Design a protein around this ligand. Sequence first.
Ligand SMILES: *C(=O)[C@@H](NC(=O)[C@H](N)c1ccc(O)cc1)[C@@H]1N[C@@H](C(=O)O)C(C)(C)S1
Length: 515
Amino acid sequence: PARSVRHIAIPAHRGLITDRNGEPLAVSTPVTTLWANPKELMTAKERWPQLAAALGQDTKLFADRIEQNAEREFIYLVRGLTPEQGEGVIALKVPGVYSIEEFRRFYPAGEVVAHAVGFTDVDDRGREGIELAFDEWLAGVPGKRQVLKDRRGRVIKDVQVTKNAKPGKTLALSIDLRLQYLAHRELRNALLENGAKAGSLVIMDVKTGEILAMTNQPTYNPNNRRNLQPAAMRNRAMIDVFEPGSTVKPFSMSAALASGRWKPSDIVDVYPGTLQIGRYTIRDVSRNSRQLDLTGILIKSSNVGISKIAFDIGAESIYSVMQQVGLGQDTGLGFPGERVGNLPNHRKWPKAETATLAYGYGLSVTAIQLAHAYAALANDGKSVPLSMTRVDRVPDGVQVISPEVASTVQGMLQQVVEAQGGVFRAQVPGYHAAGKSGTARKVSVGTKGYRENAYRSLFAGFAPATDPRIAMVVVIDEPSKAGYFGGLVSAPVFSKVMAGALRLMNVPPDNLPTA
Ligand SMILES: *C(=O)[C@@H](NC(=O)[C@H](N)c1ccc(O)cc1)[C@@H]1N[C@@H](C(=O)O)C(C)(C)S1
């Protein structure tokens, strides 16, 4: 054809992502992509070697590429150069060489918030994290332009633009970059000090359902598009499931207190520190107890104690609490590839499965689910929907644990942290803090039993105890030093991060004299 009217795409500006206070976290940056029409290049061959050198290409390999693409009318030279580098090639004035203005993401906080903010692909589309989850909101709509193409791929004139490029929309996350940096720094330090393989830390606002911080190790710099390490790009807090172990005992206890059959001052006989159930043996770490009260069962973390309570009240009541607080349940966050985990269910619960459920084996949850469950407990038993975006109007929560039961369990968890023989490393000077340690043996990758030397160290809690504001989970995978108990490995991280986060949020210190 002598003339040919066709259409080309004009890239649109991707929406700005900020933290909850407007600090930029993902910013669309103008880049210059160079393309060429090989047929037009065929008329200026003496210019090719200088063009090749400017592109850092070998002269022969470049010439070979153009010659073998002589039939085509569109060939990429280089994508995503800075407009500074792009003009240096444009300045050669080579016939048939053209530029289009595209966009590439810059991430000002880099590795500090990489998992939460996420990453974009070669075409500026979200492929991880918020970038992926809110891709429709962020992407906008590209422009569509008219053209006039010949048999040589030549363009004549303009006088067009049928469709204008629509920019994407701004998005403010629930994340507070101040708390995010604190959490990042403390988790990294903990990983290194313990020679651990991986870790996750989530901070949630118990009143609004907002995720205030979400950090994992290992992490990566999303501005380095060359490294491409899949393991480091995993948002473990949302995609890696684990047995939460003794961190679910406060939920078993909630079921016990709701049953009508148990009060905190009631007693369980846990002597001699083991309990046989068919071919399975329930075992406590500390085996020098006889009568323990319900608070003591949580302080000492007696598997025997919680198991006997579970046999009394029935597994159904415990399953119900865990399901209602969201363990093994869809979070509704809508991140593709987010893992839901699994909460086992039965019509007739056998005794072994009843016991293991009560102390957190045989179910799999994510760190986000665990933090959300603790948020409901801290928020006087009311569960506010999870959000990764800033919440200005809070949706109504669902009452999942009665307020009196939740309050009672809160006081028990304060004792876990403060009482003699408790998790003293979770204490937060100036405040009352509450929570529960866990230590879980990892199930072998093959068939293959439980891995003898591989543990996960957990601490989950909230503060300030007298008026809860923040819930936090710290999960550290395979610590390598002498300590591996959650109370040794994860509790000090909870303490350090809570100390900073409460003060960054201007929460009044509550360890005061009696009124
Ligand atoms: C819950 O997390 C419980 N953990 C275990 O019973 C676990 N199978 C285990 C026992 C012994 C080990 O050396 C390692 C793992 C109890 N709660 C824990 C906690 O951290 O609070 C323990 C006190 C380790 S036991």
